[PDB]
Amino acid sequence: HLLSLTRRAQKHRLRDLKNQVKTFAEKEEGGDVKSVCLTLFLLALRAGNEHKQADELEAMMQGRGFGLHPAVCLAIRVNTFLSCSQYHKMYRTVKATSGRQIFQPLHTLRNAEKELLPGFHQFEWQPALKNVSTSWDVGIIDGLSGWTVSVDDVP
Amino acid sequence: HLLSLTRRAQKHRLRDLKNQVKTFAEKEEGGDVKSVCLTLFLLALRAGNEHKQADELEAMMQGRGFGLHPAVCLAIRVNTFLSCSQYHKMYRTVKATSGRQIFQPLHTLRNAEKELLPGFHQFEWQPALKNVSTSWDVGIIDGLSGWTVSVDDVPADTISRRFRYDVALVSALKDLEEDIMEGLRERALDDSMCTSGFTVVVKESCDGMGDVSEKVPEKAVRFSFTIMSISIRLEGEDDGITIFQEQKPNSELSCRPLCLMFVDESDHETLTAILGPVVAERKAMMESRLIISVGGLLRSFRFFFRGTGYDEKMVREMEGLEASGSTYICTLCDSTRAEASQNMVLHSITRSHDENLERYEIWRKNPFSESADELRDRVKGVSAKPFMETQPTLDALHCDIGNATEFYKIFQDEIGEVYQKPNPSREERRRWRSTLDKQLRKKMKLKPVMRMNGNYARRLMTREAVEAVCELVPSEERREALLKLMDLYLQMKPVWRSTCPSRDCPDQLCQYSYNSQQFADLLSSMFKYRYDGKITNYLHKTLAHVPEIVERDGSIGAWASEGNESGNKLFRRFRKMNARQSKTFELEDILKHHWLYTSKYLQKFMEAHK
Ligand SMILES: [Ca+2]
Numbered sequence A: 001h002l003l004s005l006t007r008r009a010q011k012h013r014l015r016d017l018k019n020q021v022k023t024f025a026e027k028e029e030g031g032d033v034k035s036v037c038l039t040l041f042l043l044a045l046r047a048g049n050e051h052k053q054a055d056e057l058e059a060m061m062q063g064r065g066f067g068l069h070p071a072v073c074l075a076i077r078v079n080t081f082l083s084c085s086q087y088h089k090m091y092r093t094v095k096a097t098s099g100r101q102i103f104q105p106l107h108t109l110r111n112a113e114k115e116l117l118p119g120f121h122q123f124e125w126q127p128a129l130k131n132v133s134t135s136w137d138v139g140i141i142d143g144l145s146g147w148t149v150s151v152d153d154v155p
Numbered sequence B: 001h002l003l004s005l006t007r008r009a010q011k012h013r014l015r016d017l018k019n020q021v022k023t024f025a026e027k028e029e030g031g032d033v034k035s036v037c038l039t040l041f042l043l044a045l046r047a048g049n050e051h052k053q054a055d056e057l058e059a060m061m062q063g064r065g066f067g068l069h070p071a072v073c074l075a076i077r078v079n080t081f082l083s084c085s086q087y088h089k090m091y092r093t094v095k096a097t098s099g100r101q102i103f104q105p106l107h108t109l110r111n112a113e114k115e116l117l118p119g120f121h122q123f124e125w126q127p128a129l130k131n132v133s134t135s136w137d138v139g140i141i142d143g144l145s146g147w148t149v150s151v152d153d154v155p156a157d158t159i160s161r162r163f164r165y166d167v168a169l170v171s172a173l174k175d176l177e178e179d180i181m182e183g184l185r186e187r188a189l190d191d192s193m194c195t196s197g198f199t200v201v202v203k204e205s206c207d208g209m210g211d212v213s214e215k216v217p218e219k220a221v222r223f224s225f226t227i228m229s230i231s232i233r234l235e236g237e238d239d240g241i242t243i244f245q246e247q248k249p250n251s252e253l254s255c256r257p258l259c260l261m262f263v264d265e266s267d268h269e270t271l272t273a274i275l276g277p278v279v280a281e282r283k284a285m286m287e288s289r290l291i292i293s294v295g296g297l298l299r300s301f302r303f304f305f306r307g308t309g310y311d312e313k314m315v316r317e318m319e320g321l322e323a324s325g326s327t328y329i330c331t332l333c334d335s336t337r338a339e340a341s342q343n344m345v346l347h348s349i350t351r352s353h354d355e356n357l358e359r360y361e362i363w364r365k366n367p368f369s370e371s372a373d374e375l376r377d378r379v380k381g382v383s384a385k386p387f388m389e390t391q392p393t394l395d396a397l398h399c400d401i402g403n404a405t406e407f408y409k410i411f412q413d414e415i416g417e418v419y420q421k422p423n424p425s426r427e428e429r430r431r432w433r434s435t436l437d438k439q440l441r442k443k444m445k446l447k448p449v450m451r452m453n454g455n456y457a458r459r460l461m462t463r464e465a466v467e468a469v470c471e472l473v474p475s476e477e478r479r480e481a482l483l484k485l486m487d488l489y490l491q492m493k494p495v496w497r498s499t500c501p502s503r504d505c506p507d508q509l510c511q512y513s514y515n516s517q518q519f520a521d522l523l524s525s526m527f528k529y530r531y532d533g534k535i536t537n538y539l540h541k542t543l544a545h546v547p548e549i550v551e552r553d554g555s556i557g558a559w560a561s562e563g564n565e566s567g568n569k570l571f572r573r574f575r576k577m578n579a580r581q582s583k584t585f586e587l588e589d590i591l592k593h594h595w596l597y598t599s600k601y602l603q604k605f606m607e608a609h610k
């Protein structure tokens, strides 16, 4: 079996096959040796339904994503109701195993949405709004809106 | 470019080269089209000096499969209370975006788990176990155990779920197959040889839980066991050679649940009905020897069980003793309350299972025709029949709580004058409590608790907090006194709370005799007003039986029941997140999910090299 054989035995077992493939590739594609034998693999695997093999091979070759945009992750975390600490646990656990780190750490989520949250973009009005302050970078304010806290009054 | 066309486009171009490669593969390599192209491409990649991708594809179709192993995935699903549907949203999410899916689908988690749960690996008990079926594949069984449900009898109302005991044993031990073989190799012991001489020591714990905010009573009970140590016996002359000893026995992550019921601890009727088959298994398993395929070979184990994780309420309940302000305070010794304020230290361990059985006989047959109080005295507190054997042992954690509530009550008394005024009212007690609580908040920063949990007792039994309330007590002798008291207590504390005192604190053991004696003498002297004839029972256990127990049973605190108590916390979160939703299915689901949570194989991946 040419699977567990050394390099140069598979070499001279398949010299004629690789010669025929290189000749055909030079005949039709200018000579790109790699892309032909890569699609040979494409179709050879997709014959038996193991589409999973084909995906991970198109995963390696100029892959889209080792990793995810940090926004997609922040979104993942908030949309799976993940505790911050649990997600961090997961991040450490999924990074230590086969991790090139994929998920972003937590502290990069915290500055990632400073764009998603309110009070960020600059804006204005004309004519200037009435009875509304013009400061535009005010984030989350508690709604009491200036309650004159002394006790004896309406509390 | 061939990278731009459709796959039908491709086939219809590259048909003839596919035919050529298939025919040559037939005549020379066995007809293997797949491998012949894999190693072809692999060698054309190694033509360029593109070594790194040649390696990625080299480790890609062998050994490791997909991005991260399924078991690592099941484990993360478990270790984060991730709902099945939450997990699929994430799966779709991370897969659709840049994948190369990494996580595995649910139905492969659901198919790769049956390796972790009980009821999967084969075994055989030699000799045959007593009154236990021989099928080795029982999974989760419902605990009623064939109850004759007809209405007119006692009703089979109570819901329960449970494994068969031995199957859970074998599953958690084949889980420990990794570490036992690593212990076998690390010691450089023989592997194929010395297969029938293993020895396992197993701590089991039981406990119930009140005010389970259900979603029949509120209280729930959880019955669990833990693998303490594994040592070796073959081939003779010597003793048990330890191979494995639990590094963190007190942890929750090492506490394996077996049975869950929606029952209260109090009704004895329902508790014994459910937990009976279990007692017979333990008693029936003590004799036989286990035969398991471990480390590649069939091998034979023997067992020693140590029931130590019970609280005293249940320890005394489960042993026929009367509870709990009884005259016979000690579970180990026979002194009354009076006899426990007189003599603090000189005592000898007596109580066990079998004598309790015979003395119950003395109580039931009544061969000497004695009156009640004296039949009470001949048996020395043996009234009800023991149904279950528990090591006569002390629990660490609740001992700390008792001494902490006593010192809290003592501090409340000392702030005011209790040895001046021997009869105060409740007003001064609440009043004394109020200045203590204010003093505790200003100094040490600890708000009060309705009840002193263990961590507040760790912060309580320290010298600074004590000197912040010593400053309230005006007399300088009572002050210096309880301060010397606190110091003596702090020297003898790490003796019982440690895993192995013979190694971690040998010196407190050597002066333990003297340190406990000086504690008891100074208490009796400068406190006779309070400790005339009424002492609590943990104080007894700790002034009479600790050196003897820890010398006898090579370690203490390592067997407390804390590990199981804090796990109820997780039980609670598992009733919140993974509800079935049904009581019928829901206990089974908790057990399933919690058994997985407590596996070690999955905890090796939870660490991932820290
Ligand atoms: Ca308890």
Ligand SMILES: [Zn+2]
Binding pocket: B330, B331, B332, B333, B334, B347, B348, B544, B545
């Ligand atoms: Zn005793």
